[PDB]
C-alpha cells in the first residue's frame, strides 16, 4: 500500500513532536504523586482530527504523476523535514525543560508536606489519605487545577510548531503534483 509511506512521514517528522510532549506529561501523571492525586491528564489529549487526515484534505485529487514524483524526490523531502525538525526541537527544548523543572519544584514541596502525615497516620495512612482524592481537600484540588493548567499550557505552546511542521510537509507533497 502506497499510503503507508505517507502515514509514516507524518508519524516520524510531525507527530514525534507532540508525542515527545505527551511523554513529559505521562512521566508525572504515572509517578507516585500522580497515583496519589488520582490525576487524569491524558483523558482528552489526542487530536480530534489526526494529522494524516489533515494531509489528505489538503491533497484531495491524486494522480500517478504525484506517486512517480514521490519515489524520485522522497530523499529530498526526507532530508528537508529532518533538518527542520531538529531546529524546532532545540527551539522548544527550553520550554520542555521549563515545564519539567517547574513541575519538579512542586513535587518537592508536596512530598515534604505528605511524608510527615504518613508516619503520623501509621496503619491508617492507606484509607485516611483517600480524602486527598476528593473535593474537600484544599491541596488536592489545588494540585489537580495546577496539573490541568500546566498540561494545557504545554499543549498550546507546541501546537503552532506541529502545525508548521505539517504545513511544510503538505507544501512539499503539494509541489510534487504540479
Amino acid at each position: 500500500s502506497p499510503w503507508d509511506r505517507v502515514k509514516d512521514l507524518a508519524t516520524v517528522y510531525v507527530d514525534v513532536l507532540k508525542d515527545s510532549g505527551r511523554d513529559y506529561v505521562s512521566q508525572f501523571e504515572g509517578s507516585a504523586l500522580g497515583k496519589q492525586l488520582n490525576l487524569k491528564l491524558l483523558d482528552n489529549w489526542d487530536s480530534v482530527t489526526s494529522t494524516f487526515s489533515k494531509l489528505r484534505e489538503q491533497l484531495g485529487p491524486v494522480t500517478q504523476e504525484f506517486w512517480d514524483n514521490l519515489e524520485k524526490e522522497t530523499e529530498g523531502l526526507r532530508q528537508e523535514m529532518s533538518k527542520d525538525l531538529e531546529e524546532v526541537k532545540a527551539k522548544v527544548q527550553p520550554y520542555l525543560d521549563d515545564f519539567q523543572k517547574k513541575w519538579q519544584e512542586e513535587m518537592e514541596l508536596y512530598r515534604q508536606k505528605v511524608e510527615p502525615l504518613r508516619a503520623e497516620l501509621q496503619e491508617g495512612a492507606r484509607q485516611k489519605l483517600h480524602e486527598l482524592q476528593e473535593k474537600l481537600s484544599p491541596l488536592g484540588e489545588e494540585m489537580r487545577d495546577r496539573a490541568r493548567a500546566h498540561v494545557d499550557a504545554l499543549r498550546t505552546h507546541l501546537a503552532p510548531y506541529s502545525d508548521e511542521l505539517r504545513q511544510r510537509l503538505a507544501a512539499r507533497l503539494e509541489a510534487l503534483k504540479e
Epitope: K113, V114, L117, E120, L121, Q122, E123, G124, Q127, K128, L129, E131, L132, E134, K135, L136, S137, P138, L139, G140, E141, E142
Partner: antibody
Framework: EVQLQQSGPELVKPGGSLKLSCKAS?XXXXXXXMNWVRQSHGKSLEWVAXXXXXXXXXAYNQKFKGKATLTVDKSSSTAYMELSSLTSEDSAVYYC??XXXXXXXXXXXXXXWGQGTLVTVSS | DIQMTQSPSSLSASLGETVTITCXXXXXXXXXXXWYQQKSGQSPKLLVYXXXXXXXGVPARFSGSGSGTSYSLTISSLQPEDFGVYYCXXXXXXXXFGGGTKLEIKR
C-alpha cells in the same frame, strides 16, 4: 501569627436569620479547610460543618444538614456561617477553627480557634 | 458517624493528684484523635493530637494513650492552669466531639 477574627455578639429575633463572619490572617485562606463548632452554655462542643475555602465544598453533619449553610469569600479571606429560622435553642457560642492539616486532608485536628461569636435569640 | 463518650462527666481532684480521662470510640479510629482544653469563658486550645503527640507549650505532665477503642488522657500532678473543661475529638470520619469533662479543684 495565624489568627481568626470573628464578628461581635449578635441578637436575632425568633424566626429570623443569622450570618457570622470569620476573618483569617497570617496564612493562606484557600490552603486549609475551615470548621465551625457550636457550644451552648455549659454544654459540649458540637461540630457543625466544614468548608473548603479554595473550592467552596461543604460538609454538613446530620444535626445541621439543612439548618446551617457555609459560604466563603475568597477576596476578603473570610468564612461565613448562616442559620435559617433561629429559635431559643439556637442561642449558643459559635467558633471557627482552621484544620491543622496543610490542605493534605479535610477532616483533621483543629489547630487555631477563633474567640467565638455569642448568639442569643429573643423577641 | 462515630460517637465519642467520656466516662467522667465531672471530676474533682486536689492539686498534684493523678487523674485519668477516658474517651471511648464507637468504632476503630486508627489513632487520629485530639484533646482540647477549655477554660471558663475561653476558646478551646489544642492539647494533644494523634492521641499521643502533645502540642506546643504543653507540659510533660499531660500524656495520652491508646488501648483499642478507649483513648485516655492522663495528668499526674495537677496545676491551677490544668483545671477546666476537656474534650476529645475523632478526626478519621466527619469530626465529632465527646460529652465533655469538667475538672474542678477539690478542697
Amino acid at each position: 501569627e495565624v489568627q481568626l477574627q470573628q464578628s461581635g455578639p449578635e441578637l436575632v429575633k425568633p424566626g429570623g436569620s443569622l450570618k457570622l463572619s470569620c476573618k483569617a490572617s497570617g496564612x493562606x485562606x484557600x490552603x486549609x479547610x475551615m470548621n465551625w463548632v457550636r457550644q451552648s452554655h455549659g454544654k459540649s462542643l458540637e461540630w457543625v460543618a466544614x468548608x473548603x475555602x479554595x473550592x467552596x465544598x461543604x460538609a454538613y453533619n446530620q444535626k445541621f444538614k439543612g439548618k446551617a449553610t457555609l459560604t466563603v469569600d475568597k477576596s476578603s479571606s473570610t468564612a461565613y456561617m448562616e442559620l435559617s429560622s433561629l429559635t431559643s435553642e439556637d442561642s449558643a457560642v459559635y467558633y471557627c477553627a482552621r484544620x491543622x492539616x496543610x490542605x493534605x486532608x479535610x477532616x483533621x485536628x483543629x489547630x487555631x480557634w477563633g474567640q467565638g461569636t455569642l448568639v442569643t435569640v429573643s423577641s | 458517624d462515630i460517637q465519642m463518650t467520656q466516662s467522667p462527666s465531672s471530676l474533682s481532684a486536689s492539686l498534684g493528684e493523678t487523674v485519668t480521662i477516658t474517651c471511648x470510640x464507637x468504632x476503630x479510629x486508627x489513632x487520629x484523635x485530639x484533646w482540647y482544653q477549655q477554660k471558663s469563658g475561653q476558646s478551646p486550645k489544642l492539647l494533644v493530637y494523634x492521641x499521643x503527640x502533645x502540642x506546643x507549650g504543653v507540659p510533660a505532665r499531660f500524656s495520652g494513650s491508646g488501648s483499642g477503642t478507649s483513648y485516655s488522657l492522663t495528668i499526674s500532678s495537677l496545676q491551677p492552669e490544668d483545671f477546666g473543661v476537656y474534650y476529645c475529638x475523632x478526626x478519621x470520619x466527619x469530626x465529632x466531639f465527646g460529652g465533655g469533662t469538667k475538672l474542678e479543684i477539690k478542697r
